[PDB]
């Protein structure tokens, strides 16, 4: 009743039973009629107007990123290409945890609230062109968990890396895929799954490997 | 500014290894914005909660000084986290207190010098008057939960939940605005990534895990 | 089991089992953090600044009215003194329903939400200087139920009467005893209890009596 | 200026016996106020409910014309309220429709000529573009429930609840702002006090009750 | 840099160096996410619903006014036709200052903020079917500066005149060309350029001439 | 209603020559409106500024009585505006004080009798204080009218001067004497009274005199 490492050993490191219970950790999303939701809407409008700036351009690009391209999207901040060909050890580490962070860490809350997404709410398109399950953001969770892991491998560039991971979430806000509160919530959950990953042997093996590789080149 | 070279028992890192909170974090909600209007509403909600059972716990958490944070997780952890019952673990959590509470917040804290709720309303709390953004206490509470969860995964949810509530207590008690604690969790989770690159931290972590298995 | 006609036959006409379930009828009160509550606060401030006007004076007076003085507070609008001495039949009718409207019709919701009152919320006094059970307003409910009944007796003055009853609630808002949403809710509930009263034999007896008296 | 002297089957009262809604009711929330900001948020909430089960019921209630209102209480009442199964009762409720829906709202409705949600957003509804405040339908729905509750006290809560929800349906469906229906309940309850002073109404009430007892 | 009296002596009295620094005088416009902007939006909605009333009709008419028709739009309030044929001295005065108020006094701030306009923001048309440079309003500045000048010529009708000038700005709000804060800002700037105009010799010459003319059309 | 015929030294105009502020100005924001919500937020922002340097200047400007307004522009003007250093100029600005502070505000001020911030919050100010007649601000009107006049005399420093005049109004906001909308309204009315002043012979005489004096040095 839900994919995990025993169904897709290449996309997950953990089992359903090792997942963070996002439903119990996270407060509910702002309800329409609240001042907090009024803020989500205002942030949506701000993001919308940014769609035409340079920042909006980068946003449209980040919205194209599928789960698999997330790792490579940190090459600039990391300081070297994160590709299967230039760093297979590292590329393997980040790819096998994608759904631990994007799915297992968000599933519970995502399916209970079934929150509607901005574009669906306004019945308008997004900046780059599942109308529910908006809260919390799976992509943002993956983006942020990846940054935390990457920062441990290259502490010398933790700030650039952390910043990049943070902006990946904001791009979804600017592009209309999520409400601001959806991404803020995703960072709580995405940081939590990283703690669990550190208790997983396979993850630990790849981490050491990826670090050796890093020292290597 | 203090760091491991000045208080080796409260910090693991050096000033140069600190997360630049000023450049990571967006600025706090400015008065006149809708976001701040929400911070105020959350302060009122917290105020009315002061009289409930949740408010009682809140007052208790507000008494926690940096040193008592570790022991405040005993219930969630499943066993007493004290120097006497778990010196290895108690040593691990205590030596990182300021890495999370100070280094990870300093930069943004000193630039914004945000006023605190009780100071803003000129009223007391449930238990300085600036440097409210982000919350140092919340950062320490959350960094500690992330570490503790790695040692005892079987109780990660109880632990993570307790750590999350430590922050909310400061909101209910009037020490911080909601946005102050939300910000603190971003920064607190970040300092944990750096700690994992520090040899001394790594030594104690292993030690604490061994002790736990014992 | 709380008070009702079997414990205070002079303040109630109905039994606990005949009460309107306010908890199930009414939506919950505006939660702090919502736009609605922001409006309740704004109305509180408006009322506060009115405290110094003539309307504020009347407000302070209405806040002095205990459940028993409510009936007589309609004399002006009714067009004649509503007192035990000048109209005992009418005065008896209105008095015996006071808690049917002020208590039975509000109890359920009032005890579940235990909503804090404005003056308590701001830790300031009121204009006529219980801190919970604010939603819905028992007083407003009684005031409004009384107006509906009184209007049936003197249709020629229904508007003056209905208007006075409406203002009784607003005085509580201006004086700081209730949030606006507390009185709005009370009028739904107060009008409901009147439907039940019309099925009660004793009420019906006094109603006819009160009308006969009015004719004489 | 219709009233009992023009449509004796839709009204019980005369223009001169009508509640002056304009003088009773406060004005509707003005755009630019916090109150209106709340009306809009409730509109959005109702909009998103349009796809749930509650939204389905809402669409159905929006189909109800003044004449179907009485029958819409059958479930809550506990028995079919139709001309064939309860002509006495069905006659009572039908002849008061415009006393509640028109006379008790007219004054304020024509003075404010408030725009409706769907017109405001230039979008369709879930099922006139002015005279939104107060809601005539809600007033009729609420006055009917108050009357029906007097006939069957044993089910006053189901009945009162149904009547309340008829109004909310118009909110969810986009026909009215929340403040429009809240106002309608004040006015709809008032007209019921007047009806109780009307002889014809009193005759039918007794008749309807007798019928209920026989039934 | 841009146009001024040395490039279009018939639309400006002043030089770029004599311009009010609107960027340094004015506070920035309400940012989206602030309560102030929430108010700008509410006023936009109010104006939108007015589009169908009589006030909305006048609004649509005022939105047709190009910079050159502004002077004549005060004829009713002024009490007599302000046209080149009926009052060439006055008509010349008001026309030669159009860009001093509409451009020089707004340029700086207008180009820095490049504020989006309501109709563009909502992606809907206006009531009189550039998408930026909305803050402050050039038109409102010209409308208000003209009223201030006209009021000095005919003090007996200053209130009607000032009122008309004020309403020209509000029409843009009702019609969707500007946010309320854009026109409020314009009046600060428009009133300032009038102070400078009073130091300009050519302006002073025409002002006297226009007043003389005003005295003669009476008898 | 005082005017030039009762205090020829404080006014240039007569009651009949006054701008009808009530008819020109829109009403002040009503409590319960979004606009008022903004006035309150600006009051809070000003309050927190009271402890900064800008707050210090604010407190000083709040001490300014109508008679000290002229001299408060010396720095911006570029030279001391005093009876001893520039009696012609000092006489010009002083005799118009109530034209701007009273005649141009009277009508609307007395009709709305708007409560002031400090009174509203029942707290003190930043500096026996009037509690109503807040809208529009008489002080701001005088401050702004003075700036407009002073800018005509010294165009070379119009921006410094206009800026100073604008800030005089903001000080009352920061200090709690007025709501933001009170000072915004005051600048419309203050600029209008300046148009009338230019039609007044006495004013015209002193203006020329003041300019001559300015050229003199």
Cα A42 to Cα B31: distance, rounded to the nearest angstrom: 16
The set of residues, in sequence order, having a beta carbon less than 8 Å from that of F215 and lying 6+ positions away, is none
Q: How far apart are the first and last CA of chain C?
A: 41
> How many independent structural domains does chain D possess?
1
Give yes or no for a contact between A70 and A143, defined as CB atoms under 8 angstroms apart: yes
- How far lies E34's CA from each of A35, E31, E116, F37, in Å? 12, 6, 16, 11
Burial of C79 (0-12, 13-18, 19+ CB in 10 A): middle
Within 8 A by CB and 6+ apart from D180, the residues are D28, D114, D132, D133, D134, D135, D138, D170, D171
**Residue C33 in contact with partner chain A when CB distance is under 8 A:** yes
- D206/D198 Cα distance (integer angstroms): 12
Q: Which two structure tokens, joined as six digits, stand for E113?
A: 């903020």
Q: Name the structure determination technique.
A: X-ray
Which among F111, F97, F125, F116 is positioned nearest to F181, based on CA atoms?
F116
Asked if F35 reaches chain D (Cβ–Cβ under 8 Å), the answer is yes
Distance CA D69, CA A6 (A): 58
Q: How many CA atoms lie within 13 A of F183 on its CB side?
A: 24
C139 counts as catalytic: yes
Q: Which two tokens stand for residue F74?
A: 């010396």
Q: How far apart are the first and last CA of chain E?
A: 46
Q: Which residue has the tokens 């398109």?
A: A125
**Residue numbers of E annotated as active site:** 139, 172, 178, 182
Q: Which residues contact A202 (CB under 8 A, 6 or more apart)?
A: A13, A96
Q: Is E39 helix (H, G, I), strand (E, B) or coil?
A: helix
E42–chain B Cβ distance below 8 A for any pair: no
Measure the CA–CA gap between A45 and A42, rounded to whole angstroms.
Answer: 5
The 8-class DSSP code of residue B119 comes to H
DSSP per-residue codes, D54-83: HHHHHHHHHH--GGGTTGGGHHHHTS--ST
Question: Using CA atoms, how far apart are residues F143 and F65, in angstroms rounded to an integer?
Answer: 11
Q: Locate F87 and state its tokens.
A: 């009696």
Distances (CA, A) of E74 to B98, C94, C194: 70, 65, 62
In chain C, which residues are last before a break of more than 2.5 Å from C to the next N?
129
| D156 neighbourhood in chain C, CB within 8 Å | 20, 192, 195-196
CATH code for the domain of D120: 1.20.144.10
Say if F and A touch: at least 3 Cβ pairs within 8 Å.
no
Domain interval for residue E177 = 1-219
**Cβ contact D181:D167 at 8 Å:** yes
From B125's Cα to the closest Cα of chain C, the distance in A is 15
Q: What are B211's two structure tokens?
A: 């002790």
Residues of B in contact with F48 (CB under 8 A): 31, 115
Query: Max CA-CA distance within chain B?
Result: 56
Residue with tokens 């300032």: E192
The CA-CA-CA angle for residues F7, F8, F13, to 5°, reads 100
SS3 C29: coil
Integer CA distances (angstroms), D161 to C100, D60, D155, D175, in order = 19, 17, 10, 20
Ramachandran area for residue C33 (φ above 0: left; ψ -120 to 50: alpha; else beta): left
- What φ, ψ does residue A32 adopt, rounded to 5°? -65, 130
Q: Is C91 a catalytic residue?
A: no
CB contact set of B20 (below 8 Å; sequence gap of 6+): A159, B107
C160 vs F78: CA distance, rounded Å: 68
Interchain contact E/B (3 or more Cβ pairs less than 8 Å): yes
**Residue tagged 């409730």 (tokens):** D42
3-class secondary structure, C34: strand
Contact between chains at F31 and C42 (C-beta distance less than 8 A): yes
Residues 6 or more apart in contact with residue F189 via CB below 8 angstroms: F19, F21, F24, F25, F104, F105, F108, F136, F141
Q: Specify whether the CB–CB gap between E87 and E80 falls below 8 A.
A: yes
- Gap between the Cα atoms of C26 and C47, Å rounded: 24
Q: What is the DSSP letter of C16?
A: G
Nearby residues of E98 by Cβ (< 8 Å), 6 or more positions away: E11, E12, E67, E68, E70, E142
Distant-in-sequence, close-in-space partners of D61: CB < 8 Å, separation ≥ 6: D72, D165, D166, D169, D170, D173
- Which residue in this structure is represented by tokens 């104006």? E47
* Cα separation, A87 vs A81, whole angstroms: 7
Q: Is cis: bond before A136, omega within 30 of 0? A: yes
Q: Which residues of C touch B41 (CB under 8 A)?
A: 32-33, 37-38
Shortest Cα distance from C150 to chain B (angstroms)?
A: 40
Resolution for this model in angstroms, one decimal place?
2.5
Task: Assess F41–D contact: CB distance below 8 Å, yes or no.
Answer: no
Select which of C115, C139, C157, C164 is catalytic. Answer: C139
What is d(CA A162, CA A151) in angstroms, rounded to the nearest whole number? 7
Question: B27 CB near a chain A CB, below 8 Å?
Answer: no
For F71-102, b where at least 16 C-beta lie within 10 A, e where not — what string?
Answer: bbbeebbeeebeeeebebbbbbbbbbbbbbbb
DSSP chain D: ---TTT-TTT-SS-GGGS--HHHHSPPPPPBTBHHHHHHHHHHHHHHHHTTSHHHHHHHHHHH--GGGTTGGGHHHHTS--STTT-HHHHHHHHTTHHIIIIITTHHHHHHH-PPPHHHHHT-------S--SS-HHHHHHHHHHHHHHHH-GGGHHHHHHHHHHHHHHHHHHTSS-HHHHHHHHHHHHHHHHHHTT-HHHHHHHHHHHHHHHH-
Neighbours of D67 (CB within 10 A): 12
Q: How far is the C-alpha of C85 from the C-alpha of F13, rounded, in Å? A: 66
- For A10, the token pair is 């290449």
Distance from the Cα of residue C38 to its chain's centroid: 24
Q: Please tell me the number of Cα atoms within 13 Å of A81 on its side-chain side.
A: 6
d(CA C22, CA C25): 5
Cβ proximity of B28 and B112 under 8 Å: yes
Q: Among D68, D87, D96, which Cα is nearest to D214's?
A: D87
A36 and C CB contact within 8 Å: yes
Residues ≥6 apart with Cβ < 8 Å to F98: F2, F7, F10, F11, F66
D195 close to D73: Cβ distance less than 8 angstroms: no
How are the residues of chain A apportioned to helix, strand and coil, as percentages rounded to the nearest 5?
Answer: 65, 0, 35
- CA distance to B34, C63, C216, F202, per residue, from F13 (Å): 45, 50, 69, 10
Whether A168 contacts A190, CB under 8 Å: no
Output the CA torsion sign for F92, F98, F103, F104. positive
Could you give the maximum distance between any two Cα atoms of chain F, in Å? 56
Q: Of B184, B146, B183, which Cα lies nearest the Cα of B163?
A: B146
Question: Is A128 exposed, middle or buried, given 0-12, 13-18 or 19+ CB atoms closer than 10 A?
Answer: middle
Rounded CA gap, C137 and C29, in Å?
Answer: 12
Beta-ladder partners of B31: B33
- DSSP one-letter string for F42-57: HHHHHHHHTTSHHHHH
CA Rg, chain F, in Å?
Answer: 17
C-beta atoms of F48 and B31 within 8 A: yes
- Nearest-CA distance from F103 to chain B in Å? 33
C53 Cβ under 8 Å from any chain F Cβ = no
- CA dist D145 and D162 (Å) reads 8
Alpha helices in chain F, H assignment, sequence order: 21-24, 34-49, 53-63, 74-77, 87-94, 97-98, 106-112, 117-120, 138-153, 158-174, 180-197, 201-216
Enter the DSSP assignment of E106.
T
Q: How far is CA B195 from CA A188, C141, C156, E149, in A?
A: 18, 63, 83, 70
Question: Which stretches within B73-177 are classed as H helix?
Answer: 74-77, 87-94, 97-98, 106-112, 117-121, 136-151, 156-173
What is the count of residue pairs from B and F with beta carbons less than 8 Å apart?
A: 13
Structure tokens at E8: 């279009």
A118 is written with which tokens? 């901005």
3-state class (DSSP) for residue F32? coil
Sign of CA dihedral D25, D27, D28, D33: negative
**Phi (first) and psi of residue D122, to 5 degrees:** 55, 40
**Please, what sign has the CA dihedral across residues B168, B169, B171, B175?**
negative
Subunits adjacent to chain C (3 or more Cβ pairs under 8 Å) = A, B, D, F
Count of beta carbons in the 10 Å neighbourhood of residue F113: 11
- By the CB < 8 Å criterion, does B182 face chain A? yes
How far is CA F33 from each of CA C104, C171, E143, F38, rounded to the nearest angstrom? 36, 21, 29, 9
3-state SS assignment for residue A81: coil
Count Cα atoms within 13 angstroms, Cβ side, for A145.
35
Query: Residue E120: which H helix or E strand, with range?
Result: helix E118-122
Let me know: does B39 contact B178? Beta carbons within 8 Å: yes
Would you say how long chain A is, in residues? 217
CA distances from C65 to A68, C144, E90 (A): 72, 14, 69
Q: How far apart are CA E45 and CA F34, in angstroms?
A: 13
């Amino acid at each position: 009743t839900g994919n995990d490492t025993t169904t897709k050993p290449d996309l997950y490191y953990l089992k359903n039973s090792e997942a963070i219970n996002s439903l119990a950790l996270l407060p509910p999303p702002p309800a329409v009629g609240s001042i907090a939701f009024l803020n989500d809407q205002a942030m949506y409008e701000q993001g919308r107007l940014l769609r035409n700036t340079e920042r909006g351009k980068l946003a449209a690009e980040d919205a194209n990123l599928s789960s698999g391209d997330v790792a490579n999207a940190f090459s600039g901040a990391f300081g070297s290409p994160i590709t299967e060909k230039d760093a297979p050890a590292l590329h393997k580490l980040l790819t096998n945890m994608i759904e631990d962070a994007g799915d297992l860490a968000t599933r519970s809350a995502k399916d209970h609230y079934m929150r509607i997404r901005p574009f669906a709410f306004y019945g308008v398109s997004t900046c780059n062109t599942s109308k529910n399950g908006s809260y919390p953001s799976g992509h943002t969770s993956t983006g942020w968990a990846t940054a935390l892991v990457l920062a441990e491998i290259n502490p010398q560039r933790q700030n650039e890396i952390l910043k990049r991971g943070y902006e990946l979430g904001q791009s979804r806000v600017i592009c209309g895929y999520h409400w601001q509160s959806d991404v803020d919530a995703a960072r709580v959950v995405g940081s939590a799954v990283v703690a669990t990953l550190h208790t997983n042997p396979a993850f630990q093996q790849q981490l050491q490997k990826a670090k050796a590789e890093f020292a290597q080149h």
